[PDB]
Amino acid sequence: DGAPPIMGSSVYITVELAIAVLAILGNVLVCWAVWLNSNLQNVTNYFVVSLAAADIAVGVLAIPFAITISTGFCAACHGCLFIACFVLVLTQSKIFSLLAIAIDRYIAIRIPLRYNGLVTGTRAKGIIAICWVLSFAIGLTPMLGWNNCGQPKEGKNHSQGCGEGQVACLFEDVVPMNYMVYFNFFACVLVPLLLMLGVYLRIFLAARRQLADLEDNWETLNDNLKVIEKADNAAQVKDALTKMRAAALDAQKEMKDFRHGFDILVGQIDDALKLANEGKVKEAQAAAEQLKTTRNAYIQKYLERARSTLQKEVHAAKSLAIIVGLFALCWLPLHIINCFTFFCPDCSHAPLWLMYLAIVLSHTNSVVNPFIYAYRIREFRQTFRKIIRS
Ligand SMILES: CC(C)CCC[C@@H](C)[C@H]1CC[C@H]2[C@@H]3CC=C4C[C@@H](O)CC[C@]4(C)[C@H]3CC[C@]12C
Ligand SMILES: CC(C)CCC[C@@H](C)[C@H]1CC[C@H]2[C@@H]3CC=C4C[C@@H](O)CC[C@]4(C)[C@H]3CC[C@]12C
Ligand SMILES: CC(C)CCC[C@@H](C)[C@H]1CC[C@H]2[C@@H]3CC=C4C[C@@H](O)CC[C@]4(C)[C@H]3CC[C@]12C
Ligand SMILES: CCCCCCCC/C=C/CCCCCCCC(=O)OC[C@H](O)CO
Ligand SMILES: CCCCCCCC/C=C\CCCCCCCC(=O)O
Ligand SMILES: CCCCCCCC/C=C\CCCCCCCC(=O)O
Ligand SMILES: CCCCCCCC/C=C\CCCCCCCC(=O)O
């Protein structure tokens, strides 16, 4: 007395095909953009490309697999396992790519001087290839023996008339829910997501601390100038100049144009320090006044450029954090439903329509990343226009 299953099946299959088309087109555009623009050919975008390659595979393979397993067709149980678990391989690869992007950005903001020598393209390719191997091993673990193939639903397999060694290919009949909850969700998805949260929190903490240190050195420069102009004793000028020389060397610790600026600044401070040690107070004050011209024509240019670079790193890290957040938004509902199915056997199973709504939502994650790049990364957006208009 239920509606014919092909009616709801047609809606589900049509929606899945719409998602596969959008996932392929958008992520092919991302890969094409990185190929054409050398400004997008950095190590960070090598993981973005691996991220896009997995989403392309979601539309090409994982979504046709999901359509197949929804029919419950008779199949050899290990072949049904591969059909059911291959999306876990792709998803695990994206988790590894997302974690590497956060680590790459944390390295770029914590030690930017050592970044290009530490994070190279060759090492990135090796990391990516290793993570794909681990993704296959993690996602296909049920094929190694952790499955319900040894406990088949004989009622379903007889009613559908499956042959010997065959089962009705249904996800929750062949894939153990304890694998899905403890192994896949808790260990392989939830824990890495929490690690990404901690890395991005450390990224924003590092940026906030460095931006405050730039303003601290800047105000230390201007406040000690007022101390010298209103000083009366020679030691007052000397103590204020010693603290400027520390804040000057600690601020540097066309790139030589900024190095030449601190050379003038420290040189003038040493000039005023020599006069202050001699007892000359008026001549030491006038020498310290020369620091203002160096501050305007040099030191202020470094502050605003160093501040601009840090603000770009904050904005870029926020964009990459949105991608992690949308990943969790798309996949957590399916994981949470499996937790209810596993941990509350007295709860009624989530209805059929909610199951496939959660499945469809997890697939839409393969569509959203190209939109994040187009809206939040100007280099991607301008390359997208160039590809499309020509
Ligand atoms: C390079 C790409 C495009 C190749 C695609 C490979 C896919 C389409 C192939 C490889 C292994 C194949 C599975 C191997 C096991 C059999 C078991 C059988 O009872 C039903 C079909 C099933 C489940 C096959 C489904 C399709 C399958 C998953
Ligand atoms: C992570 C963000 C998007 C929030 C996730 C909300 C979803 C995953 C939660 C909120 C309410 C939850 C439902 C509340 C009612 C129960 C009834 C029980 O018999 C089956 C599970 C079911 C149906 C839960 C399924 C998962 C659920 C729908
Ligand atoms: C990403 C953050 C939010 C952590 C992930 C949320 C998960 C771990 C939490 C949120 C809601 C929790 C569920 C809330 C309802 C209870 C019902 C109980 O009978 C079994 C445990 C169960 C089903 C919990 C299982 C674990 C659970 C699904
Ligand atoms: C089975 C599911 C869980 C398994 C998880 C525990 C496995 C233990 C450690 C494995 C080492 C990593 C193996 C992957 C490396 C593949 C080789 C490769 O390609 O490495 C190229 C590298 O750039 C230069 O060799
Ligand atoms: C670029 C290629 C992308 C994939 C092309 C193939 C498109 C076909 C999509 C899914 C087909 C699913 C077949 C359904 C299996 C039905 C099982 C049964 O007969 O009982
Ligand atoms: C198989 C060996 C794994 C260790 C090498 C891989 C490097 C770390 C990989 C991910 C672990 C989680 C990292 C958590 C934050 C690390 C960033 C940091 O502390 O600087
Ligand atoms: C530049 C780097 C490009 C990386 C391409 C991706 C390579 C992925 C290769 C296939 C790994 C499959 C082998 C895993 C075996 C264990 C899975 C299993 O059979 O259980």
Side-chain angles (χ1 to χ4, degrees), residues 1-201 203-252 257 260-388 390:
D1 283 354
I6 194 185
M7 298 184 64
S9 172
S10 299
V11 171
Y12 169 68
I13 291 177
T14 304
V15 169
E16 288 284 3
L17 293 183
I19 296 174
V21 172
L22 301 176
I24 295 168
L25 290 176
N27 289 282
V28 160
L29 182 63
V30 168
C31 295
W32 197 357
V34 178
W35 178 280
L36 293 178
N37 194 346
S38 64
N39 302 334
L40 293 172
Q41 298 177 10
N42 50 81
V43 172
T44 310
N45 286 341
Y46 297 159
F47 297 104
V48 173
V49 165
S50 177
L51 203 60
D55 286 324
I56 293 173
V58 167
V60 174
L61 290 178
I63 286 186
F65 289 0
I67 295 172
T68 301
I69 203 186
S70 64
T71 66
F73 76 119
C74 296
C77 191
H78 280 62
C80 179
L81 278 174
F82 180 84
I83 289 299
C85 292
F86 185 72
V87 64
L88 309 178
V89 174
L90 303 177
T91 299
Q92 196 61 42
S93 178
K94 305 210 307 183
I95 284 291
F96 283 137
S97 291
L98 290 171
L99 180 59
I101 289 174
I103 293 175
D104 170 83
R105 291 298 85 204
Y106 179 74
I107 292 177
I109 200 171
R110 192 72 161 179
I111 43 172
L113 302 170
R114 283 169 272 177
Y115 176 83
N116 293 323
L118 168 61
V119 190
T120 70
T122 300
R123 297 174 184 173
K125 295 180 181 179
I127 296 305
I128 292 176
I130 289 171
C131 292
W132 271 101
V133 171
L134 297 178
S135 302
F136 273 89
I138 289 173
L140 303 180
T141 290
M143 304 188 73
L144 302 189
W146 195 356
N147 53 69
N148 303 325
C149 293
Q151 296 78 25
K153 311 283 293 185
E154 300 290 353
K156 303 182 183 184
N157 300 334
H158 284 3
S159 62
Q160 205 185 148
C162 301
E164 309 307 322
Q166 288 186 339
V167 297
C169 189
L170 299 168
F171 186 95
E172 294 193 1
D173 286 2
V174 296
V175 184
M177 198 59 81
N178 52 19
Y179 164 86
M180 294 302 305
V181 173
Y182 289 139
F183 194 96
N184 191 88
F185 184 28
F186 285 175
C188 296
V189 173
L190 191 53
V191 165
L193 285 178
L194 298 180
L195 288 173
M196 302 176 203
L197 175 67
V199 173
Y200 281 110
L201 281 170
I203 289 181
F204 297 129
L205 282 174
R208 188 191 67 170
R209 182 175 295 109
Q210 294 179 19
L211 281 173
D213 292 352
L214 286 175
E215 297 295 329
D216 288 355
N217 285 333
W218 172 255
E219 297 173 3
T220 301
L221 188 78
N222 294 331
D223 277 336
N224 282 332
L225 282 179
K226 308 184 305 177
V227 173
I228 299 173
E229 296 177 353
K230 300 185 177 183
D232 295 333
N233 189 20
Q236 295 176 341
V237 179
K238 180 182 182 178
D239 290 331
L241 282 165
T242 298
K243 299 167 183 175
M244 292 182 65
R245 202 183 187 279
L249 300 182
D250 222 1
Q252 61 177 348
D257 172 67
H260 180 66
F262 277 95
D263 295 357
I264 302 172
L265 184 75
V266 179
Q268 291 175 330
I269 294 180
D270 287 351
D271 289 352
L273 267 174
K274 185 171 62 180
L275 297 166
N277 291 10
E278 293 167 337
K280 306 174 175 62
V281 287
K282 290 293 185 61
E283 194 171 352
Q285 289 169 325
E289 185 69 16
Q290 297 293 320
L291 298 161
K292 293 188 179 301
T293 61
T294 312
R295 172 202 60 188
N296 305 329
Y298 292 92
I299 305 304
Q300 189 174 359
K301 297 291 183 59
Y302 171 83
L303 169 67
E304 293 178 338
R305 290 313 99 191
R307 183 182 62 197
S308 184
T309 302
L310 280 174
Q311 289 171 334
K312 290 189 304 178
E313 278 177 286
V314 176
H315 189 279
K318 290 184 177 182
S319 304
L320 300 169
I322 292 178
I323 293 155
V324 179
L326 292 176
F327 182 96
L329 184 67
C330 292
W331 280 102
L332 279 181
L334 194 49
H335 287 293
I336 290 169
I337 293 173
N338 289 338
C339 288
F340 276 95
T341 301
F342 180 74
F343 285 124
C344 185
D346 285 355
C347 298
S348 301
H349 195 294
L352 178 78
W353 68 267
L354 182 61
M355 294 301 305
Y356 284 106
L357 175 62
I359 295 172
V360 156
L361 175 62
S362 75
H363 294 168
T364 64
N365 181 249
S366 303
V367 190
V368 302
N369 292 344
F371 282 90
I372 300 299
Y373 308 143
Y375 274 99
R376 292 199 58 98
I377 307 183
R378 176 178 293 108
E379 196 64 40
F380 268 106
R381 176 172 58 256
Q382 292 173 330
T383 311
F384 289 167
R385 299 202 199 102
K386 172 75 179 182
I387 296 175
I388 288 156
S390 68

